[PDB]
């Protein structure tokens, strides 16, 4: 009902934070030449359509992606608002939206749903990723409170604490995107509740530069490409 | 349940002599609020009837014409302490259901002072308004313990800016 606890703390935000603390794990890592996003997906359903095109990971425009921990129903309302804002910026300025302007845009909407008592807050945590000329490769996180922070590597959702410790000891400022592929897969295999990692339990993506000077490219990996980085990395659930 | 009959007696004559404090008016109202706590804890009637007599001696008379009863109410520390002391006795009895017959009688003396538009009458208006407020959940049963003219003497106590 958006009233303070006597400590000056918001009960609804704390309960929304309890909800996302169950909501599946996501890791993001910022290499010297690209960003990696990975998310672990609890497929307890055989008849759920794996090889559906998205669940945890989404495009916001041609150079920005997100991972979702939380309610996917809540996330998709924010994701569409961010997509509309990215194209409305591109229409106005003829230029691609800077990552800080969009990440904090979704952090200002999520704060409003925490102040007015007719609205429940959004049960979603986002690990944003992208490139722009103002900064370069940027990795941000945002949570049900409307707080947002810049990171070199971060986890959200379940098992955050184990994942942050594993990131901290292996992360290097000068590492390449293929080292961040390896690291994010290792971290998730060293954090997972499921017995071993496999291509349908895993959502993956990258924000590389490629060979051509003007390019930045956002491969949100199809299952067969994820099977290749799995067998190359030594996670290798292979015949 | 700790003090004796010589220590509670010292406490009483200290709070009662603070009812006639010649320099402070805030120490005269504070003392009533505490003489109520002394009186509420009495278990027998003979102390209370003698206190009622002490406080009623300056009151309970037609010795004053309305202009004396008015000008004394702006000035006189003695009747101020006696009205505050009798209101302290009345407010010590918030929830006694069959209303003791001395309460209507002593409310009748206070309600003469409640019309007097100064510091002495103020203590009486506060006494009667606090009384009606605590007796607002019993009032259909307590209205029987008063005469018709006594219930009218309880009426006009709120001199608030928004009551016409």
């Amino acid at each position: 009902t958006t009233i303070f606890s006597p400590e000056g703390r918001l009960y609804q935000v704390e309960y929304a934070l309890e909800s996302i603390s169950h909501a599946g794990t996501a890791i993001g890592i910022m290499a010297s030449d690209g960003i990696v996003l990975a998310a672990e997906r609890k497929v307890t359903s055989t008849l759920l359509e794996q090889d559906t095109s998205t669940e945890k990971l989404y495009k916001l425009n041609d150079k920005i992606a997100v991972a979702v921990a939380g309610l996917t129903a809540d996330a998709e309302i924010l994701i569409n608002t961010a997509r509309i804002h990215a194209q409305n910026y591109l229409k106005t300025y003829n230029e691609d939206i800077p990552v800080e302007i969009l990440v904090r845009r979704l952090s200002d909407i999520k704060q409003g749903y925490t102040q007015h008592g007719g609205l429940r807050p959004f049960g979603v945590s986002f690990i944003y990723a992208g490139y722009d000329d103002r900064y370069g490769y940027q990795l941000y996180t945002s949570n049900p409170s409307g707080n947002y922070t810049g990171w070199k590597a971060i986890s959200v959702g379940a098992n955050t604490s184990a994942a942050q410790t594993l990131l901290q000891m292996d992360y290097k400022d000068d590492m390449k995107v293929d080292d961040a592929i390896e690291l994010a897969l290792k971290t998730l295999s060293k954090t997972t509740d499921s017995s071993a990692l496999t291509y349908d339990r895993l959502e993956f993506a990258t924000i590389r530069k490629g060979a051509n000077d003007g390019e930045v490219y956002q491969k949100i990996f199809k299952p067969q490409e994820i099977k290749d980085i799995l067998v190359k990395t030594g996670i290798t659930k292979k015949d | 349940l700790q003090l004796t009959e010589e220590e509670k007696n010292k406490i009483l004559e200290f709070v009662v002599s603070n009812l006639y404090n010649e320099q402070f008016v805030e120490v005269r109202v504070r003392a009533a609020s505490i003489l109520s706590d002394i009186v509420h804890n009495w278990k027998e009637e003979q102390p209370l009837l003698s206190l009622i007599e002490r406080f009623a001696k300056g009151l309970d008379v037609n010795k004053y014409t309305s202009k004396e009863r008015q000008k004394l109410s702006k000035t006189d520390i003695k009747i101020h302490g006696n009205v505050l002391g009798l209101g302290a006795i009345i407010s010590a009895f918030p929830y006694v259901f069959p209303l003791p017959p001395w309460i209507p009688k002593q409310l009748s003396n206070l309600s003469s002072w409640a019309r007097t538009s100064g510091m002495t009458g103020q203590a009486a208006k506060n006494t009667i308004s606090e009384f009606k407020k605590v007796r607002a959940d019993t009032w259909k049963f307590d209205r029987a313990s008063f005469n018709t003219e006594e219930l009218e003497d309880l009426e006009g106590v709120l001199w608030r800016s928004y009551y016409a």
Partner: protein, 90 residues
Amino acid sequence: NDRHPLESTLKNWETTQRQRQMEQYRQIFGIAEPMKRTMEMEIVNRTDFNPLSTNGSIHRDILLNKECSIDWEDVYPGDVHSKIEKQLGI
């Protein structure tokens, strides 16, 4: 003026057609019928606030008899704090 003949008519069409309907129901059925219909619409409009959705409401289309009809206004449609401090008064 230089302003299209049809502009002021089509701007106010939705309001005008309901205002005209309520006056017919007052005339044919008495003051109780538009008093009932305006209070149903008040409960539906006033208890249905969500800063990110502006695309009408499902029960308002049932109440307005618009549940199987499209206008050009439904195919061609046209800050959360500014919405909040309009809904509550500033």
